[PDB]
Amino acid sequence: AEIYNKDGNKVDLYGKAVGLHYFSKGNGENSYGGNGDMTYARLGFKGETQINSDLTGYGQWEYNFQGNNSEGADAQTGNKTRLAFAGLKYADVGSFDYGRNYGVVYDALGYTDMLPEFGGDTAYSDDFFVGRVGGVATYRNSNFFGLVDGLNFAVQYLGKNERDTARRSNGDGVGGSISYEYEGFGIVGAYGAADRTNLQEAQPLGNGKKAEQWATGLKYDANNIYLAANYGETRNATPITNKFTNTSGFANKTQDVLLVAQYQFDFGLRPSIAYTKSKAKDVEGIGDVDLVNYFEVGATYYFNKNMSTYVDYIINQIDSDNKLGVGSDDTVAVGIVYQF
């Protein structure tokens, strides 16, 4: 919601209140998404001020507030800051911002991150270039300096983040994307690579000093039709765990495929169909393991632009014999979302 627009500085304060609930067999510890209340909310703001007629300053902050906690000690479990950055966009040169923001490889993975609830599996947060990250300096350029419509590129610089965890840690690195949008087609390629840190190298699963991720997208988005596909691979970057040996680390290699098919009816119904398959390769002592695999059937029914509800169903293809001990049961999400 645009709560303010005076003296060329508009502030968009927005939020969400998602009544949500998962359904999985038993206590669902063996299910794709889990079982239980999953209600949460959001709050944030994106500001934009015009320094002049070419230069624009902008800032954004988004925060997730969990609603499925009690007002006891667990109150904060899950609350986190999702985005926080600032920048200046200028004429045709391009934009530059810095802070907690999405990694460039997300640009590609973005194409398939359209499911009602689930999906987006390979875009782990705090995992180098595929999801939200801390301290990334990003430079994007539009229409190749205005010369070519639809030709976009960006180069990101990931700063080293040595945290308490190997999972949330990352060394420094660089990445970049290139996308061309035309008619209702989009084609993307993005890649990045950064140093793994000592703690990361110290983990039992995964071996290397350089983690690199890359993926490409293709999409036909026009005339109530959304079709998109993603494919990517990674070296020592997808976090994994062996539930049996109680070991953790990263998959040495992974072949990722994401597919989406969605149609937007006029009356508000927007069914969804998708396929997700992530397979780790060269996992020590195991070899090839499916980290994710399933089919999705879903439907979001938008009332107006500030209301909707959706049902998401995950036909979990993962089998019980999974080596890493991944869950094999299905999950069903049922949400009702109010926003502004």
Given candidates 28, 33, 94, 99, which one binds a copy of itself under the rule CB under 8 A?
Answer: 99
Given candidates 1, 91, 222, 225, which one binds a copy of itself under the rule CB under 8 A?
Answer: 1
Could you tell me if 36 and 54 are in contact, meaning their C-beta atoms sit under 8 angstroms apart?
no
Between CA 321 and CA 77 the distance in angstroms is: 32
Give the x-and-dash track for 260-299 against a copy of itself (CB under 8 A): ----------------------------------------
Binding of residue 147 to a copy of itself (CB under 8 A)? no
Per CB under 8 A, which region of 13-21, 111-119, 143-151, 211-219 contacts a copy of itself? Answer: 13-21
Nearest CB to a copy of itself, comparing residues 160 and 209: 160
Binding of residue 164 to a copy of itself (CB under 8 A)? yes
Nearest CB to a copy of itself, comparing residues 218 and 336: 336
Could you tell me if 61 and 81 are in contact, meaning their C-beta atoms sit under 8 angstroms apart?
yes
In three-state secondary structure terms, 110 is helix
Given candidates 34, 93, 95, 98, which one binds a copy of itself under the rule CB under 8 A?
Answer: 98
**Which residues have CB under 8 Å from 245's CB, separation 6+?**
204
Nearest CB to a copy of itself, comparing residues 15 and 150: 15
| Total residue count of the chain as it appears in this document | 340
Strands (E), the chain: 2-5, 9-23, 36-37, 40-50, 55-66, 80-90, 94-102, 132-141, 151-158, 173-182, 185-195, 210-222, 225-242, 247-263, 269-283, 287-302, 307-316, 331-339
Binding of residue 241 to a copy of itself (CB under 8 A)? no
Strands (E), 130-209: 132-141, 151-158, 173-182, 185-195
Given candidates 51, 148, 202, 315, which one binds a copy of itself under the rule CB under 8 A?
Answer: 51
Given candidates 25, 29, 54, 55, which one binds a copy of itself under the rule CB under 8 A?
Answer: 55
Between CA 81 and CA 39 the distance in angstroms is: 17
Nearest CB to a copy of itself, comparing residues 76 and 224: 76
Nearest CB to a copy of itself, comparing residues 198 and 320: 198
Given candidates 89, 140, 167, 277, which one binds a copy of itself under the rule CB under 8 A?
Answer: 167
Given candidates 34, 66, 93, 221, which one binds a copy of itself under the rule CB under 8 A?
Answer: 66
Question: Cα-flanking dihedrals φ and ψ of residue 112, to 5°?
Answer: -95, 0
Residues 293-322 that bind a copy of itself (CB under 8 A): 303-307
238: left (phi over 0), alpha (psi -120 to 50) or beta: beta
Q: How far is the CB of 180 from a copy of itself (least distance, A)?
A: 29
Binding of residue 325 to a copy of itself (CB under 8 A)? no
Total binding residues toward a copy of itself, as defined by CB under 8 A: 84
Binding of residue 82 to a copy of itself (CB under 8 A)? yes
Could you tell me if 176 and 96 are in contact, meaning their C-beta atoms sit under 8 angstroms apart?
no
> What does DSSP say about strands 307-316 and 225-242: parallel, antiparallel, or unpaired?
unpaired
Binding of residue 53 to a copy of itself (CB under 8 A)? no
Binding of residue 19 to a copy of itself (CB under 8 A)? yes
Between CA 241 and CA 256 the distance in angstroms is: 18
Given candidates 24, 28, 32, 87, which one binds a copy of itself under the rule CB under 8 A?
Answer: 87
